[PDB]
Amino acid sequence: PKQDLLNDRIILVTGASDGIGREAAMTYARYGATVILLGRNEEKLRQVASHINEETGRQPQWFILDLLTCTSEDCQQLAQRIAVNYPRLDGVLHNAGLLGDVCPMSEQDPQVWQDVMQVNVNATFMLTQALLPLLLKSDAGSLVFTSSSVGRQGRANWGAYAASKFATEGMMQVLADEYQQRLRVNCINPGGTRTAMRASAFPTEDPQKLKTPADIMPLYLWLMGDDSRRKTGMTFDAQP
Amino acid sequence: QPKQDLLNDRIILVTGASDGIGREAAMTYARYGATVILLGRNEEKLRQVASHINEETGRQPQWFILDLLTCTSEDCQQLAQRIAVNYPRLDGVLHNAGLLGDVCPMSEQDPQVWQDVMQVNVNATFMLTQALLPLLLKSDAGSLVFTSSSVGRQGRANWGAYAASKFATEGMMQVLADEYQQRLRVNCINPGGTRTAMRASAFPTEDPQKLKTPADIMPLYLWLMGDDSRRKTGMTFDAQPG
Ligand SMILES: NC(=O)C1=CN([C@@H]2O[C@H](COP(=O)(O)OP(=O)(O)OC[C@H]3O[C@@H](n4cnc5c(N)ncnc54)[C@H](OP(=O)(O)O)[C@@H]3O)[C@@H](O)[C@H]2O)C=CC1
Numbered sequence: 001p002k003q004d005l006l007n008d009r010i011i012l013v014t015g016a017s018d019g020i021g022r023e024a025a026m027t028y029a030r031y032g033a034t035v036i037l038l039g040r041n042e043e044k045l046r047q048v049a050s051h052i053n054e055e056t057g058r059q060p061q062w063f064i065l066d067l068l069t070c071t072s073e074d075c076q077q078l079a080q081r082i083a084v085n086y087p088r089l090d091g092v093l094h095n096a097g098l099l100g101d102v103c104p105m106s107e108q109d110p111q112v113w114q115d116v117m118q119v120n121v122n123a124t125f126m127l128t129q130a131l132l133p134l135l136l137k138s139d140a141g142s143l144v145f146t147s148s149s150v151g152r153q154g155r156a157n158w159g160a161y162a163a164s165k166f167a168t169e170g171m172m173q174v175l176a177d178e179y180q181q182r183l184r185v186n187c188i189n190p191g192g193t194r195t196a197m198r199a200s201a202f203p204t205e206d207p208q209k210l211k212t213p214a215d216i217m218p219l220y221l222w223l224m225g226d227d228s229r230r231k232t233g234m235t236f237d238a239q240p
Numbered sequence: 241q242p243k244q245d246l247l248n249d250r251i252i253l254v255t256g257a258s259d260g261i262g263r264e265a266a267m268t269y270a271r272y273g274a275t276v277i278l279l280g281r282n283e284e285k286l287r288q289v290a291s292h293i294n295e296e297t298g299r300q301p302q303w304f305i306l307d308l309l310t311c312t313s314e315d316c317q318q319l320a321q322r323i324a325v326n327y328p329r330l331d332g333v334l335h336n337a338g339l340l341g342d343v344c345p346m347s348e349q350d351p352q353v354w355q356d357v358m359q360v361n362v363n364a365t366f367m368l369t370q371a372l373l374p375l376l377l378k379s380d381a382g383s384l385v386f387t388s389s390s391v392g393r394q395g396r397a398n399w400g401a402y403a404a405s406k407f408a409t410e411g412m413m414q415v416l417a418d419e420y421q422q423r424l425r426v427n428c429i430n431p432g433g434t435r436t437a438m439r440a441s442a443f444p445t446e447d448p449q450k451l452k453t454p455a456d457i458m459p460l461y462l463w464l465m466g467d468d469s470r471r472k473t474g475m476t477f478d479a480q481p482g
């Protein structure tokens with residue numbers, strides 16, 4: 001993949017404040033993208049923004065949207081503020097996500113559970129709905145959901161996370177079918193990656209023996225770039 | 241498939257008991273000897289189904305109210321305590337209750353309707369399953385059945401919240417299926433298109449006499465609550481292969 005793969009492409013990334021979303025941003029940016037950052041923490045996004053600026057020379061915008069509490073109006077309002085500065089979106093990476101409770105179904109807490117489906121499904125549904133006009137105004141728009149392997153096959157103790165990655169996958173498949181030959185619409189399964197969500201989940205696992213968000217990026221770029229134009233409605237594993 | 245003493249002295253709770261496919265499961269289970277618990281949100285609809293199952297079997301079911309759009313974790317724990325009082329287990333639970341919501345472009349889906357659908361179909365069904373898992377554990381071969389749709393396995397245009405909710409349902413089932421291996425049977429049914437009112441809402445033009453009725457598709461519904469399926473778990477089954 002050439003260093004100018006994403007020149008003059010407008011790419012928005014959620015959960016840009018930390019982890020995979022952080023790394024996706026910086027990288028899309030190094031590949032020449034106009035990146036847009038979303039998160040819920042102004043102080044964290046300022047730092048990401050700052051670091052990308054020191055990296056590439058361009059200061060990316062960040063917008064605030066807490067996905068737990070956000071409504072359709074706020075999301076629609078966020079679309080408004082993005083149209084102010086940008087003619088279109090070429091890519092939207094829905095990367096934000098809440099892990100919630102990792103325990104037996106009998107132990108799973110119902111408020112954390114309703115927080116998980118709020119952030120991973122609803123708020124992500126709502127926000128997609130608002131950004132679709134800007135994605136359609138692009139020459140080949142790319143919408144990406146982040147799944148997980150419990151989004152394909154429920155294992156014990158994954159609970160609310162899992163149900164919500166299943167929903168992410170069907171949500172992706174409805175959309176891809178509706179935007180056939182208008183939009184690329186896909187899922188990425190990152191697989192286990194050196195982040196603080198992964199570690200919460202696996203206290204004992206050694207993170208240094210994991211691939212970093214950096215290492216898993218070839219797929220993140222491929223799905224935003226011209227070589228995936230013909231691909232839609234699929235779930236790609238960053239680590240097959 | 242079966243025989244009329246099959247579900248003899250098995251105790252089965254059916255949500256969405258007051259109409260469509262749950263009404264029929266409840267009615268059908270009871271004619272095969274089951275002691276049925278009817279759940280729904282409409283007292284009169286429920287009164288009627290109970291009365292009808294009485295006049296058919298001579299055993300009158302008990303019915304309970306839970307509005308899965310509005311219930312809290314507490315509301316469901318209470319109910320389960322209520323059940324635990326008259327009842328010494330649950331050999332079976334059919335989560336039939338469902339909300340269709342808007343069938344329309346993802347661009348057009350109402351956000352509140354979207355959230356209503358996930359609440360009935362994923363969260364309340366979650367919270368309800370949770371409150372009843374102890375009683376189910378008390379069965380010798382308890383059966384937990386969810387209801388999916390073919391768009392819970394493969395999203396298609398215009399299914400919005402309901403396709404999302406049914407994937408989340410298959411997902412949910414697989415987790416539970418993983419944690420209760422050799423403890424519970426935990427499967428899904430895909431009914432197929434069935435002559436009910438939810439179906440009609442989605443296919444207003446469809447001639448409903450071209451569909452199978454709830455009663456045409458009951459074998460599977462019956463197969464899964466009895467002993468012929470005892471070692472099978474973690475799977476989605478089609479009531480209409482095709
Ligand atoms: N890391 C891994 O091994 C795997 C991760 N995934 C998925 O990858 C994606 C990224 O996860 P990862 O980078 O690992 O995790 P992190 O927890 O490190 O970061 C997740 C991002 O989501 C944001 N976020 C969480 N809740 C909200 C909210 N309510 N409003 C706005 N933003 C929110 C966080 O913001 P902030 O923290 O700044 O508040 C953060 O920016 C997620 O979809 C995750 O589910 C899938 C498989 C494996």
Ligand SMILES: NC(=O)C1=CN([C@@H]2O[C@H](COP(=O)(O)OP(=O)(O)OC[C@H]3O[C@@H](n4cnc5c(N)ncnc54)[C@H](OP(=O)(O)O)[C@@H]3O)[C@@H](O)[C@H]2O)C=CC1
Nearest residue numbers: 256260261281282307308309336337338433434436438439
């Ligand atoms: N019919 C079909 O072609 C197919 C059906 N299905 C699934 O089969 C199941 C049965 O559907 P079907 O019989 O067709 O539908 P019906 O609409 O005719 O019945 C659905 C049942 O769920 C109950 N319900 C809805 N919302 C709530 C709520 N908030 N609280 C408590 N109960 C509620 C209804 O109660 P009430 O009447 O009292 O309001 C009703 O008893 C559903 O889960 C549906 O998803 C899946 C694929 C195909």
